[PDB]
Amino acid sequence: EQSLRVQLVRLAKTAYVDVFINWFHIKALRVYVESVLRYGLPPHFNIKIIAVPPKNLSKCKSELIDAFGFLGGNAFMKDKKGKINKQDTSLHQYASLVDTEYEPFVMYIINL
Amino acid sequence: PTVQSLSERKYSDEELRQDISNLKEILENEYQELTSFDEYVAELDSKLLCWSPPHVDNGFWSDNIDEFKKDNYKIFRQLIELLQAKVRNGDVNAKQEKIIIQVALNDITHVVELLPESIDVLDKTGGKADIMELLNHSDSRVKYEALKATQAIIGYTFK
Amino acid sequence: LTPNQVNDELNKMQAFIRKEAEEKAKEIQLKADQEYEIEKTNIVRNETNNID
Amino acid sequence: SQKNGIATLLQAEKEAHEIVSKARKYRQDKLKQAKTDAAKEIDSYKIQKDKELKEF
Amino acid sequence: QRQVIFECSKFIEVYMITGSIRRTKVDILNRILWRLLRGNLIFQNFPIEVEKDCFIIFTHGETLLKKVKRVIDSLNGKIVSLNTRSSELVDTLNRQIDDLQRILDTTEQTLHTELLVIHDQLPVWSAMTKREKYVYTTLNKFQQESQGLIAEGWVPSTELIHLQ
Amino acid sequence: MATALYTANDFILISLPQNAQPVTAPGSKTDSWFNETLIGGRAFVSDFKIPEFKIGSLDTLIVESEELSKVDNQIGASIGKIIEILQGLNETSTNAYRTLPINNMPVPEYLENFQWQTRKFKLDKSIKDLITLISNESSQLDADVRATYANYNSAKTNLAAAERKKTG
């Protein structure tokens, strides 16, 4: 048990950092891939990662949705503060799997 | 048909029953047990056509389709040619010519419903138009057969 | 949406179709230059053996 | 501008196909060229092998 | 199929898929295609006037075009690809609508000819069977002992001499 | 959040055209808007522009998005398991194992120099295989931590059982 215990705490810790870098890889690549696929020209994108001080995430997301959402579509920008999530039948769906409402502009939210 | 009906409604005396059963067997056996290809070729050639027990069966056609091919279903094509000929020459609704039409039309439905390639043959020969006229040509059995002849064609063109 | 919005997306459509095809077409012609040299060396080595 | 736009989109798709086909046309030609540009190296070796024979 | 051409030439006159669908499945097809293609579509619908509906998709791109069709053909949507003209298929399709409507007018005339000899005869054919089945149901209630049926049952005493 | 951060912050990753503009308060440069306007100027904005990837076709692009989505949940899952195993062991800190600075370097700061990290991932490679490598790595790590814990839980049962045999 003792031998397993040292090995396990160390392994989890090393694993942690690695799994974290890989997660951030996927998200960065997933925003680039999405951006080219929906927008098209211009080839290069202006990408930023904005750190929100704690518990102001909602109000932040709303100020972005209202600012940039217009590019996606005139009717496709609705006011939302907090992640709206739908999963009821095929009349309401929200996910990258299937959707019938989403973010009008390309946005992923990262929380630890 | 008369014998078959009788078989259900038998008469008390045994001997009567024996005669009903023995006669029933010869008539039925005799027609089916002759080759399918033989019967079809024999009727079309002589130009005298009539429905018969194995001449109206689905199976008769199923076996005989492949055999027809010699110059793109040449025998079937001759039949469509016969249906076409009868209507134009000598008019229609003359006793002889009217018997043939109903039979010719029964034969063509089964073949068409069976193979989708038959659709080209109606169009090339020009049988497809002749059928549309036959709906309009008098007598209940004639318009009945024409409607069946048309519905089989339609199904493969447009589903 | 509005016809205008749907036309901005239309313009995007023919943009995509064209760009992935130029990208495809560069790879397609680059395999064709590797293939020219290689086929040319292979014809020659075979033949000099016959002449030998 | 609805059917004027569709026709541009339509043209866009032909231009894309032509771009792809052009690269395929290149390879086809390059296959004939490989035989052409190999035919010149071969017949220069053939007359050299005869030269050193005419010596023997 | 005529209406989804009439309502999709009009949409162009005002990578796309045109077809028919039942009206109760339009919203679920919209939601499934929106969850499959993340955005990336312009989905319309125009009611064909069972009730049905048309749809235009505009699958902006590739590599899912054979997968949108597995959504449409699963819930019984019939795509109508034209690829030639919206005025040349309409003639070849109206040359079949009337040609098949005349076969309707032939076979339904034959149907109403056949029903004339039957509608005035069904009270005889029905009333034969309603009492013939009633005869055999009662003949099942008898004995069949020694090549002769034994009918045991009740009769009032006033009607004994009437039976005898 | 207020306990699932202790030196981190929460992040929104967005991408816009370099032609995007805000309509919250017009006339402003996108870069200026993020700093000045977005929640009272408290917003810490960092660069995250990653270079091009090869892209083979239009069809294949679609298939890429599918992979990115599933794997990303799978990796999120895998972090959920690892953190659950540390708590289980009774490793809890006020600044680790429930936040954990990436490599003992604050989290906002790590993202600021995350400009496509290279650990065996190359910016001139094909996109598809890289997606697979990242997902393979994590999966193997996930099996390792899980497998070792299983043996830990089993081993504890032998000690417990045995303690009653020696006195109980």
- The C-alpha atoms of residue B135 and residue B101 are separated, in whole angstroms, by 12
Question: Can you list the positions of beta strands (E) in chain A?
Answer: 46-52, 107-110
Query: In angstroms, what separates the C-alpha of D2 from chain E's closest C-alpha?
Result: 6
Q: Domain residues for A81?
A: 43-112
Chain C contacts of F58, Cβ < 8 Å? 16-17, 20
Residue F152 with chain A: CB contacts under 8 Å? 1, 4-5, 8
Cβ–Cβ pairs < 8 A, chains A and E:
41
Beta bridge partners of residue F44, listed in sequence order: A51
- Flag if B143 and E110 touch (Cβ within 8 Å): yes
Closest CA to F80 of F12, F145, F1, F165: F145
Using a CB-CB cut-off of 8 Å, the residues of chain C touching D41 are 44
Length of chain B (residues): 159
Q: What's the length of chain A?
A: 112
Q: Which CATH code of 1.20.1530.20, 3.40.50.150, 3.30.70.100, 1.20.1460.10 fits the domain covering F50-168?
A: 1.20.1460.10
Residue with tokens 């699932």: F4
Scan for tokens 């030196």, then name that residue.
F7
* Cα separations in angstroms, B94 against B48, B78, B84, B104: 14, 22, 15, 16
The DSSP secondary-structure symbol of E4 reads H
For domain B38-157, is the CATH number 1.25.40.150? yes
**Distance of alpha carbon F168 from alpha carbon F157, whole angstroms:** 16
Compute CA distances F149 → A47, F81, F156, whole Å. 40, 11, 11
Q: How far away is chain F from the Cα of C28, in angstroms, using its nearest Cα? A: 11
Angle, in degrees to the nearest 10, between helices B118-125 and B140-157: 120
Chains touching chain C through at least 3 C-beta pairs below 8 angstroms are: A, D, E, F
**Paired strand residues for A110:** F11
The residue among C1, C8, C12, C13 with the most chain E CBs within 10 A of its CB, best to mutate, is C13
* Chain A residues touching F6 at Cβ < 8 A: none
Q: How far apart are CA E31 and CA A99, in angstroms?
A: 6
Rounded distance between C-alpha atoms, residue A49 and residue F28, angstroms: 19
DSSP state of E159: G
Residue with tokens 């080759």: B35
3-state SS record for chain B: CHHHHHHHCCCCCHHHHHHHHHHHHHHHHHHHCCCHHHHHHHHHHHCCCCCCCCCCCHHHHHHHHHHHCCCCCHHHHHHHHHHHHHHHCCCCCCHHHHHHHHHHHHHHHHHHHHCCCHHHHHHHHCHHHHHHHHHHCCCHHHHHHHHHHHHHHHHHHCC
Give the tokens for residue F71. Answer: 């794997």
Dist CA B89 CA E56 (whole Å): 53
Nearest to C15 among A41, A75, A76 (CB): A41
> Which residues does C10 contact at the CB level (< 8 Å), separation at least 6?
D5, D6, D9
Amino acid letter at A40?
G
Q: Is the distance from CB of F135 to CB of F73 less than 8 angstroms?
A: no
The C-alpha atoms of residue C9 and residue A75 are separated, in whole angstroms, by 14
Experimental method: cryo-EM
Phi, psi of F25, deg, nearest 5: -155, 90
Name the β-bridge partners of A109.
F12
CB of F19 within 8 Å of a chain A CB? The answer is yes
β F44-47/E44-47 pair status: unpaired
Site from C9, C11, C12, C24 to mutate, E interface, most E CB atoms within 10 angstroms? C9
How many Å apart are CA E34 and CA E26, to the nearest integer?
A: 12
Q: How far away is chain A from the Cα of E41, in angstroms, using its nearest Cα?
A: 10
Strands A46-52 and A107-110, bridge-based pairing: unpaired
Contact D38 C40 (CB under 8 A): yes
Tokens of C2: 């509005």
Cβ–Cβ of C12/A41 closer than 8 Å?
Answer: yes
- D48: its two tokens: 């050299």
How many angstroms separate the CA atoms of B22 and B26, rounded?
7
What DSSP character marks residue A69?
Answer: G
Judging contacts by C-beta atoms under 8 Å, the chain F residues touching residue A42 are 17-19
Q: What's the length of chain C? A: 52
Q: H or E stretch including E21?
A: strand E18-22
Which of E15, E42, E61 has its CB closest to that of C6? E42
Q: How many CB atoms lie within 10 A of CB F149?
A: 19
CB F105 within 8 A of CB A42: no
Nearest to E11 by CA among E49, E57, E70: E57
Return the biggest CA–CA distance within chain B. Answer: 61
Q: From CA F8, how far away is CA F44, in angstroms rounded? A: 12
| Spatial contact of D44 and C45, defined as CB atoms under 8 Å apart | no
Q: Provide the chain E residues 56-75 that lie in CB contact (below 8 A) with chain A.
A: 61
Per-residue 3-state assignment (H helix, E strand, C coil) for F38-68: HHHHCCEEEECCCCCCECCCHHHHHHHHHHH
Residues B108 and A9: their CA atoms lie apart, in Å, by: 83
Residues B115/B93, Cβ–Cβ less than 8 Å? no
Question: How do strand A46-52 and strand F44-47 relate by DSSP bridges?
Answer: antiparallel
| Three-class SS state of F80 | helix
Q: Which residues touch C29 (CB under 8 Å, ≥6 apart)?
A: D23, D26, D27
Using alpha carbons, select from C20, A25, A51 the residue that is nearest to residue F50: A25
